[PDB]
Amino acid sequence: YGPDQRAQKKGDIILGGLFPIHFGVAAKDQDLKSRPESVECIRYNFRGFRWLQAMIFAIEEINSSPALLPNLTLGYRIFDTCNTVSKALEATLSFVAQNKIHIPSTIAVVGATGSGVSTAVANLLGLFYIPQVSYASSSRLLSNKNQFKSFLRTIPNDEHQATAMADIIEYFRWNWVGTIAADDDYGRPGIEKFREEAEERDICIDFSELISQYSDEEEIQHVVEVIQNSTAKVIVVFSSGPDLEPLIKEIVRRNITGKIWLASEAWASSSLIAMPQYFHVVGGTIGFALKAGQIPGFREFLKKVHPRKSVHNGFAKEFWEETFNCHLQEFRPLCTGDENISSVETPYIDYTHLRISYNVYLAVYSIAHALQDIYTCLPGRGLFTNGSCADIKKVEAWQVLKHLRHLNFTNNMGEQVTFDECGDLVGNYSIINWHLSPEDGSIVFKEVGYYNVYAKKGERLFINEEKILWSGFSREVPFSNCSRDCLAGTRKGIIEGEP
Amino acid sequence: YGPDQRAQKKGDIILGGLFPIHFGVAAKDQDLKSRPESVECIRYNFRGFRWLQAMIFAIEEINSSPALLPNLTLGYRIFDTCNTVSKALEATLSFVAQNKIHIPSTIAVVGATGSGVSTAVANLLGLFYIPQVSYASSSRLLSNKNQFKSFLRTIPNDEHQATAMADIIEYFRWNWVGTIAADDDYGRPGIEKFREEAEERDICIDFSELISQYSDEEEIQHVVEVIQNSTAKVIVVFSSGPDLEPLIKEIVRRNITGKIWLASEAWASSSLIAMPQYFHVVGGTIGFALKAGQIPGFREFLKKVHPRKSVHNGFAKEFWEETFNCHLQERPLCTGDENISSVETPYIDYTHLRISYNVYLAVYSIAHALQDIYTCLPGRGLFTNGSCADIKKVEAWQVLKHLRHLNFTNNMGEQVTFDECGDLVGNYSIINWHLSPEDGSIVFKEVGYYNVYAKKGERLFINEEKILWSGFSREVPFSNCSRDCLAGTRKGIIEGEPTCCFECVECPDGEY
Ligand SMILES: *[C@@H]1O[C@H](CO)[C@@H](O[C@@H]2O[C@H](CO)[C@@H](O)[C@H](O)[C@H]2NC(C)=O)[C@H](O)[C@H]1NC(C)=O
Ligand SMILES: *[C@@H]1O[C@H](CO)[C@@H](O[C@@H]2O[C@H](CO)[C@@H](O)[C@H](O)[C@H]2NC(C)=O)[C@H](O)[C@H]1NC(C)=O
Ligand SMILES: *[C@@H]1O[C@H](CO)[C@@H](O[C@@H]2O[C@H](CO)[C@@H](O)[C@H](O)[C@H]2NC(C)=O)[C@H](O)[C@H]1NC(C)=O
Ligand SMILES: N[C@@H](Cc1c[nH]c2ccccc12)C(=O)O
Ligand SMILES: N[C@@H](Cc1c[nH]c2ccccc12)C(=O)O
Ligand SMILES: *[C@@H]1O[C@H](CO)[C@@H](O)[C@H](O)[C@H]1NC(C)=O
Ligand SMILES: *[C@@H]1O[C@H](CO)[C@@H](O)[C@H](O)[C@H]1NC(C)=O
Ligand SMILES: *[C@@H]1O[C@H](CO)[C@@H](O)[C@H](O)[C@H]1NC(C)=O
Ligand SMILES: *[C@@H]1O[C@H](CO)[C@@H](O)[C@H](O)[C@H]1NC(C)=O
Ligand SMILES: [Ca+2]
Ligand SMILES: [Ca+2]
Ligand SMILES: [Ca+2]
């Protein structure tokens, strides 16, 4: 059961996992004139492979520490989703293969990345009460506990992002904008929340459009026609890189400049949009980012992968091949095997901060500490029936979920990690700016403030306007009002139809 | 296996089924202090039982006719979903149980009602390329063929409904309304489309709220207060009966009267809201409806039910118990000789068949897809090299391919064919809620239609002479946020308020 390439290790306790190794699937048509065959995957995601190694590192750090879960070993079974629902469902059917009835059971799943994939996986995982701990899903629809009974996450939701964007617009005195969002369960609720917030602060919106990764030519042309027919220089986008690339390509080949973008977290640091060829269009973007944690011995673990020594990993071979443009054997030169991964610039060991990787780390330690709480329990002071402890020899999924619901522990950085009613965390935000490197010629992200989620309303945002390059060259705030303000000797008037 | 309650029969080809026999599940939630049990369904839906009987009737009619499918017999396997995702997922896992690994396979499935349930079912059914035909799901999110490969339906989507509501509001000139929607995949896209159209037509919307079947007291109280403060008389609702009942209960308890409700097809005929004691609030509602059909011999088959002769129907015993307030023993004891006509229930208390006619069409659609595979000639086929499939060993994707190229004639002399998004087209009927003078009861009276086959601006037709506003009044209400400027005067601006609301200032001296 399950797909062919996988990261698998045996042990007393087995943990699941879903990571987007590939960016997407093939644009194919199957008019069913023959028996259908399995779809393929196209592009290679080096960021996703880095997230995969964080879970392995956390598990192997737990197994080597006698203070956490002694006399017990943890395994894993990690698959690939290709950013599609169907592959995730194929893997999940293997996750719950024994509960529906030679395959070990699953007690915890480190959830997917996309919101739609997470929803589709959770709808099936909630039947058997198997906890799922996501690390990048920030939709507000997953906070509903009537439908998703066993969903937890280590990332905050998207209400504060919309509120902060409205706060920025109010801060810089703009009242004429336009909105774009992806066509999924992550973009639509967020853009709706932003519209709800902006209606109260008297901000008028000109156009609203929806995009998708599989949009045809005559839906991109219409969207880019609507954009250039407007007089608003401020555009708000709730989408990811794969869902935004075609529109950006079309805009670039048309050479449309002068717009100001307010990026969400999904594409704030995406490598598909932050390209020097696009700088004369996407330059000067303002976006949001999370707070970066610390993992001490992580670079050494990343810099010791090998297609032959990493027998437990099935993605290492393709990582080597895609990195070195080389072909392994059991145009493309043959692989010697002694090549060095430090000589190639890829989003694998070329990073400045760890944000989602820290989330994977935290999810694995949350599961481990729930298991530890099960382990070190005194009978008569438990959490089940008349007060009892669950046996660590025969632990089940729902007991782990119950312990996760009542979790409180201090991480390696010296701060508590507690899950709220709907299994969410609250955290700070960091506001960044897109610059141009003077020496290397790449794109540099620079912090220009922060968003405080603890302070009172109206005292949260903090902007250092002195360090904002408005288009990479400008040092003056853009004008984005619909009409010029009247003077002392005049008054206002009404234009029929217009807001 | 799956759930214990079911209705199945042996045959060469088996069809699936998903009907909402109940309205919902129990309100109990576990604290995870013990092993969780199976959730239980609470209310009984007499409308959902009628739709199942339509599928059974269609199959039994096909088996008797030699012209349609000789030498082949159709069975069935029908489950209950209770308007819940988990039950439907369990039933669907039972449907595809053979293909995960003795178990017969399911050629086709007649889909669910709710869009949220249908999406969850289709996500799992699309892996195995099993065709699914829905009779009530009408969300536009299900028209994306890049995700739902094998979804088909016999009901139009809601874009035309939203445009029709905008046209109705434009016909009776109002520019100050409100909107209420359900928090699922059905009410959100429709309300977004309506907001787009209303902004296009220069109509101002005051508020916008979201409700759900499991909303607590504070949310309902906040929603009602929002409606109370605003002066917008006209309210537009995109939801169903179960999701709207708590709000209507709270409003009726607080006695808020005078609003004009525009109703979607989901609750324009629901028996949970169309009640005589709600009339002083929901009276005079204007809503949409589908087009009725004819199924001769249906009522007799409906009236020949019994909890003993129905060997193949496991839902009949609870039907009898609920109908006669009895208890069958293997609450008085059941004699078993009572008359169905004695008890007045939504089972046979109907006037037109509108959703139960879609089940008929779905069953004949699958039947005609199998007649095409059955009868063909070598070199004349939809598959590779012009070859034909094997009727003796037929697969699901062949049925899907033949469904994508289907063109047949209904019983009542009209054509059916499906678009390449698996959707259909049809007209609408606009009804008005009255009060019957003989028996106090809501009565729906048709006042106009919406010809979807016409050009823009010539589709809506409304007869005003048969509309009773608020159920008694004969005068068109008023909703504009501002009294009209009379003459010799100028518009004004009020700060912080929409352009729909002005001040009516007088002109300067020497002008006109
Ligand atoms: C979230 O951000 C706020 C401000 O950005 C943090 O508050 C700061 O806390 C440090 C140390 O406690 C103080 O030295 C600063 O003066 C605080 N800033 C302000 C504006 O009061 C807060 O600690 C952050 N939260 C977390 C969990 O790190
Ligand atoms: C663009 O419009 C905004 C609001 O429409 C203007 O913000 C006003 O700024 C003045 C002076 O700073 C304040 O007295 C007003 O209260 C602000 N408006 C509101 C609604 O608070 C802004 O000045 C305009 N910018 C330009 C360049 O005209
Ligand atoms: C309520 O407002 C609507 C539009 O804001 C009014 O409709 C206008 O009516 C005048 C004549 O009274 C026509 O000349 C306009 O063409 C109408 N506008 C549109 C867009 O159709 C309506 O009359 C107002 N109601 C009342 C009672 O005055
Ligand atoms: N929050 C996104 C997922 C996401 C977060 N960060 C990302 C970075 C890259 C790609 C996707 C993401 C969603 O729900 O859809
Ligand atoms: N169109 C509805 C389905 C529906 C039609 N009539 C109904 C009556 C009751 C409940 C649901 C329905 C939906 O998308 O969900
Ligand atoms: C595109 O627009 C920029 C900005 O004005 C201009 O400098 C450039 O010449 C244009 N054409 C290109 C980049 O081919
Ligand atoms: C978690 O435990 C620490 C231990 O002192 C305590 O200070 C903190 O308040 C606890 N967190 C919650 C949410 O109770
Ligand atoms: C369907 O069949 C009818 C009658 O054979 C024919 O007139 C029509 O062109 C066919 N196709 C469509 C799309 O209706
Ligand atoms: C809709 O109504 C028009 C006119 O009333 C009619 O010509 C057309 O055939 C109808 N279509 C359907 C699908 O009923
Ligand atoms: Ca250990
Ligand atoms: Ca306008
Ligand atoms: Ca206002």
PDB file of all heavy atoms in Angstrom, chain A residues 375-393:
ATOM      1  N   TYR A 375       4.010   8.825  29.232  1.00  0.00           N
ATOM      2  CA  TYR A 375       4.966   7.901  29.837  1.00  0.00           C
ATOM      3  C   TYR A 375       5.090   8.129  31.340  1.00  0.00           C
ATOM      4  O   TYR A 375       4.844   7.219  32.141  1.00  0.00           O
ATOM      5  CB  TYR A 375       6.328   8.046  29.151  1.00  0.00           C
ATOM      6  CG  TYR A 375       7.456   7.309  29.835  1.00  0.00           C
ATOM      7  CD1 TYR A 375       7.638   5.946  29.644  1.00  0.00           C
ATOM      8  CD2 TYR A 375       8.346   7.977  30.665  1.00  0.00           C
ATOM      9  CE1 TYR A 375       8.669   5.271  30.264  1.00  0.00           C
ATOM     10  CE2 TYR A 375       9.379   7.309  31.289  1.00  0.00           C
ATOM     11  CZ  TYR A 375       9.536   5.957  31.086  1.00  0.00           C
ATOM     12  OH  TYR A 375      10.564   5.286  31.706  1.00  0.00           O
ATOM     13  N   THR A 376       5.473   9.341  31.745  1.00  0.00           N
ATOM     14  CA  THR A 376       5.701   9.649  33.160  1.00  0.00           C
ATOM     15  C   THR A 376       4.398  10.129  33.803  1.00  0.00           C
ATOM     16  O   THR A 376       4.168  11.316  34.041  1.00  0.00           O
ATOM     17  CB  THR A 376       6.849  10.647  33.313  1.00  0.00           C
ATOM     18  OG1 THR A 376       7.130  10.857  34.705  1.00  0.00           O
ATOM     19  CG2 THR A 376       6.585  11.979  32.602  1.00  0.00           C
ATOM     20  N   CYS A 377       3.533   9.165  34.111  1.00  0.00           N
ATOM     21  CA  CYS A 377       2.251   9.445  34.739  1.00  0.00           C
ATOM     22  C   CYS A 377       2.098   8.571  35.974  1.00  0.00           C
ATOM     23  O   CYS A 377       2.542   7.419  35.990  1.00  0.00           O
ATOM     24  CB  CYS A 377       1.083   9.188  33.776  1.00  0.00           C
ATOM     25  SG  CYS A 377      -0.591   9.466  34.453  1.00  0.00           S
ATOM     26  N   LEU A 378       1.464   9.122  37.005  1.00  0.00           N
ATOM     27  CA  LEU A 378       1.210   8.408  38.249  1.00  0.00           C
ATOM     28  C   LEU A 378      -0.252   8.003  38.318  1.00  0.00           C
ATOM     29  O   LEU A 378      -1.131   8.862  38.157  1.00  0.00           O
ATOM     30  CB  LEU A 378       1.567   9.282  39.446  1.00  0.00           C
ATOM     31  CG  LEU A 378       3.032   9.709  39.562  1.00  0.00           C
ATOM     32  CD1 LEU A 378       3.221  10.721  40.684  1.00  0.00           C
ATOM     33  CD2 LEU A 378       3.936   8.504  39.770  1.00  0.00           C
ATOM     34  N   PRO A 379      -0.553   6.720  38.531  1.00  0.00           N
ATOM     35  CA  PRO A 379      -1.956   6.283  38.540  1.00  0.00           C
ATOM     36  C   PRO A 379      -2.767   7.005  39.606  1.00  0.00           C
ATOM     37  O   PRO A 379      -2.273   7.309  40.694  1.00  0.00           O
ATOM     38  CB  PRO A 379      -1.863   4.779  38.825  1.00  0.00           C
ATOM     39  CG  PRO A 379      -0.447   4.521  39.241  1.00  0.00           C
ATOM     40  CD  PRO A 379       0.385   5.590  38.620  1.00  0.00           C
ATOM     41  N   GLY A 380      -4.030   7.277  39.276  1.00  0.00           N
ATOM     42  CA  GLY A 380      -4.924   8.005  40.150  1.00  0.00           C
ATOM     43  C   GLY A 380      -4.934   9.504  39.948  1.00  0.00           C
ATOM     44  O   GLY A 380      -5.789  10.184  40.529  1.00  0.00           O
ATOM     45  N   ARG A 381      -4.014  10.041  39.152  1.00  0.00           N
ATOM     46  CA  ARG A 381      -3.937  11.467  38.859  1.00  0.00           C
ATOM     47  C   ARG A 381      -3.827  11.692  37.358  1.00  0.00           C
ATOM     48  O   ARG A 381      -3.127  12.594  36.892  1.00  0.00           O
ATOM     49  CB  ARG A 381      -2.762  12.116  39.587  1.00  0.00           C
ATOM     50  CG  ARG A 381      -2.441  11.497  40.938  1.00  0.00           C
ATOM     51  CD  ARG A 381      -1.476  12.361  41.730  1.00  0.00           C
ATOM     52  NE  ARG A 381      -0.514  11.560  42.478  1.00  0.00           N
ATOM     53  CZ  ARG A 381      -0.732  11.060  43.687  1.00  0.00           C
ATOM     54  NH1 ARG A 381      -1.876  11.262  44.321  1.00  0.00           N
ATOM     55  NH2 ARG A 381       0.219  10.340  44.273  1.00  0.00           N
ATOM     56  N   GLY A 382      -4.517  10.871  36.582  1.00  0.00           N
ATOM     57  CA  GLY A 382      -4.454  10.922  35.136  1.00  0.00           C
ATOM     58  C   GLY A 382      -5.477  11.856  34.532  1.00  0.00           C
ATOM     59  O   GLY A 382      -5.887  12.849  35.141  1.00  0.00           O
ATOM     60  N   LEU A 383      -5.895  11.532  33.308  1.00  0.00           N
ATOM     61  CA  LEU A 383      -6.854  12.345  32.577  1.00  0.00           C
ATOM     62  C   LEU A 383      -8.016  11.542  32.003  1.00  0.00           C
ATOM     63  O   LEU A 383      -8.842  12.120  31.290  1.00  0.00           O
ATOM     64  CB  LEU A 383      -6.155  13.101  31.433  1.00  0.00           C
ATOM     65  CG  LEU A 383      -5.288  14.316  31.772  1.00  0.00           C
ATOM     66  CD1 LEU A 383      -3.890  13.891  32.180  1.00  0.00           C
ATOM     67  CD2 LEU A 383      -5.226  15.268  30.591  1.00  0.00           C
ATOM     68  N   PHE A 384      -8.116  10.242  32.295  1.00  0.00           N
ATOM     69  CA  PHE A 384      -9.098   9.357  31.676  1.00  0.00           C
ATOM     70  C   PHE A 384      -9.959   8.665  32.726  1.00  0.00           C
ATOM     71  O   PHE A 384      -9.459   8.266  33.787  1.00  0.00           O
ATOM     72  CB  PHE A 384      -8.413   8.286  30.832  1.00  0.00           C
ATOM     73  CG  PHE A 384      -7.541   8.831  29.745  1.00  0.00           C
ATOM     74  CD1 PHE A 384      -6.169   8.921  29.922  1.00  0.00           C
ATOM     75  CD2 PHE A 384      -8.084   9.249  28.547  1.00  0.00           C
ATOM     76  CE1 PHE A 384      -5.363   9.421  28.923  1.00  0.00           C
ATOM     77  CE2 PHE A 384      -7.284   9.749  27.546  1.00  0.00           C
ATOM     78  CZ  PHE A 384      -5.923   9.836  27.734  1.00  0.00           C
ATOM     79  N   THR A 385     -11.258   8.517  32.415  1.00  0.00           N
ATOM     80  CA  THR A 385     -12.255   7.875  33.283  1.00  0.00           C
ATOM     81  C   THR A 385     -12.197   8.386  34.728  1.00  0.00           C
ATOM     82  O   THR A 385     -12.360   9.595  34.953  1.00  0.00           O
ATOM     83  CB  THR A 385     -12.133   6.351  33.205  1.00  0.00           C
ATOM     84  OG1 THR A 385     -10.860   5.888  33.701  1.00  0.00           O
ATOM     85  CG2 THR A 385     -12.403   5.850  31.786  1.00  0.00           C
ATOM     86  N   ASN A 386     -11.950   7.524  35.719  1.00  0.00           N
ATOM     87  CA  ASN A 386     -11.922   8.005  37.101  1.00  0.00           C
ATOM     88  C   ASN A 386     -10.558   8.564  37.475  1.00  0.00           C
ATOM     89  O   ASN A 386     -10.142   8.476  38.640  1.00  0.00           O
ATOM     90  CB  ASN A 386     -12.244   6.885  38.102  1.00  0.00           C
ATOM     91  CG  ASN A 386     -13.525   6.140  37.800  1.00  0.00           C
ATOM     92  OD1 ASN A 386     -13.481   4.975  37.433  1.00  0.00           O
ATOM     93  ND2 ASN A 386     -14.675   6.813  37.938  1.00  0.00           N
ATOM     94  N   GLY A 387      -9.798   9.001  36.485  1.00  0.00           N
ATOM     95  CA  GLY A 387      -8.427   9.409  36.707  1.00  0.00           C
ATOM     96  C   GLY A 387      -7.567   8.173  36.555  1.00  0.00           C
ATOM     97  O   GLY A 387      -7.535   7.342  37.466  1.00  0.00           O
ATOM     98  N   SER A 388      -6.856   8.034  35.436  1.00  0.00           N
ATOM     99  CA  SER A 388      -6.103   6.824  35.115  1.00  0.00           C
ATOM    100  C   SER A 388      -5.015   7.227  34.125  1.00  0.00           C
ATOM    101  O   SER A 388      -5.079   8.298  33.516  1.00  0.00           O
ATOM    102  CB  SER A 388      -7.022   5.741  34.522  1.00  0.00           C
ATOM    103  OG  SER A 388      -7.988   5.299  35.465  1.00  0.00           O
ATOM    104  N   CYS A 389      -4.033   6.345  33.933  1.00  0.00           N
ATOM    105  CA  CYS A 389      -2.983   6.598  32.953  1.00  0.00           C
ATOM    106  C   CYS A 389      -3.069   5.571  31.822  1.00  0.00           C
ATOM    107  O   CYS A 389      -3.394   4.389  32.043  1.00  0.00           O
ATOM    108  CB  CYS A 389      -1.590   6.568  33.595  1.00  0.00           C
ATOM    109  SG  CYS A 389      -1.325   7.671  35.064  1.00  0.00           S
ATOM    110  N   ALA A 390      -2.790   6.048  30.600  1.00  0.00           N
ATOM    111  CA  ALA A 390      -2.736   5.188  29.416  1.00  0.00           C
ATOM    112  C   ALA A 390      -1.386   4.467  29.347  1.00  0.00           C
ATOM    113  O   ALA A 390      -0.325   5.068  29.557  1.00  0.00           O
ATOM    114  CB  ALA A 390      -2.958   6.006  28.139  1.00  0.00           C
ATOM    115  N   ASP A 391      -1.419   3.176  29.014  1.00  0.00           N
ATOM    116  CA  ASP A 391      -0.185   2.399  28.949  1.00  0.00           C
ATOM    117  C   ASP A 391       0.639   2.791  27.722  1.00  0.00           C
ATOM    118  O   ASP A 391       0.133   2.793  26.596  1.00  0.00           O
ATOM    119  CB  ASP A 391      -0.487   0.897  28.911  1.00  0.00           C
ATOM    120  CG  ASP A 391       0.697   0.040  29.365  1.00  0.00           C
ATOM    121  OD1 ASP A 391       1.486   0.508  30.209  1.00  0.00           O
ATOM    122  OD2 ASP A 391       0.824  -1.109  28.879  1.00  0.00           O
ATOM    123  N   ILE A 392       1.920   3.105  27.937  1.00  0.00           N
ATOM    124  CA  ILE A 392       2.802   3.465  26.828  1.00  0.00           C
ATOM    125  C   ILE A 392       3.100   2.266  25.938  1.00  0.00           C
ATOM    126  O   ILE A 392       3.588   2.434  24.814  1.00  0.00           O
ATOM    127  CB  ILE A 392       4.105   4.091  27.362  1.00  0.00           C
ATOM    128  CG1 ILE A 392       4.786   4.935  26.281  1.00  0.00           C
ATOM    129  CG2 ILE A 392       5.043   3.014  27.877  1.00  0.00           C
ATOM    130  CD1 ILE A 392       3.905   6.013  25.705  1.00  0.00           C
ATOM    131  N   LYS A 393       2.815   1.052  26.413  1.00  0.00           N
ATOM    132  CA  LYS A 393       3.011  -0.137  25.595  1.00  0.00           C
ATOM    133  C   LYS A 393       1.927  -0.290  24.535  1.00  0.00           C
ATOM    134  O   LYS A 393       2.187  -0.855  23.466  1.00  0.00           O
ATOM    135  CB  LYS A 393       3.058  -1.379  26.486  1.00  0.00           C
ATOM    136  CG  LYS A 393       3.439  -2.657  25.759  1.00  0.00           C
ATOM    137  CD  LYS A 393       4.105  -3.651  26.695  1.00  0.00           C
ATOM    138  CE  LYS A 393       5.572  -3.313  26.905  1.00  0.00           C
ATOM    139  NZ  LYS A 393       6.342  -3.355  25.632  1.00  0.00           N
TER     140      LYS A 393
END
